[PDB]
Amino acid sequence: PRHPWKLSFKGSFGAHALSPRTLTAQHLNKLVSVEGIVTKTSLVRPKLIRSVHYAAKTGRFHYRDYTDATTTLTTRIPTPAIYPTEDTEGNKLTTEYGYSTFIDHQRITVQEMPEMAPAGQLPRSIDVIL
């Protein structure tokens, strides 16, 4: 008959089926399945991945890719590439919205369920990026 394929997981997680209270620092850099209640849901915000620009003097389209520590599982060297407003020859660039790519980003807060929480203590919560 281009976007890379993602993976999702179901099944028994064993000791990795945890709670926002039960999550400690021994579970860092591990795949965890956390059950809870959603308390806060941030606004779905687009995040720029590749920006496309136009040079009218030479009439050419450029692009720049952007990455952060969230989109990758393996940490790489952080190279902050600034937003290009000028090409290598010195000509002004116009941002081509509609050709740039934006990926929806959300933050949610997962708290322990009031059914499984201790009845008098303050609840524990975690942040999840989507």
Partner 1 sequence: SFDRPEIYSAPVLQGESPNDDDNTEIIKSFKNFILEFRLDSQFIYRDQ
Partner 2 sequence: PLRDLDSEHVSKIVRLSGIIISTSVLSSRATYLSIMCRNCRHTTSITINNFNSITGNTVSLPRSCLSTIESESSMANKKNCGPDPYII
CB of 39 to partner 2, least distance (A): 29
Residues 6+ apart with CB under 8 A from 20: 34, 36, 110, 111, 112, 123, 124, 125, 126
Using the minimum distance from each CB to partner 1, give the nearer residue, 9 or 97. 97
Q: Is 109 in the site for partner 1 (CB under 8 A)?
A: no
* 7 vs 63: CA distance, rounded Å: 28
Residues 6+ apart with CB under 8 A from 96: 52, 53, 54, 61
Among 22, 33, 85, 106, binds partner 2 (CB under 8 A): 85
Q: Binds 92, which of partner 1, partner 2, none (CB < 5 to 8 A, cut-off by type)?
A: partner 1
Q: What does the binding site for partner 1 look like in residue numbers (CB under 8 A)? A: 48, 51, 83, 85-86, 92-95, 97, 100
Q: What does the binding site for partner 2 look like in residue numbers (CB under 8 A)? A: 66, 75, 77-88, 90
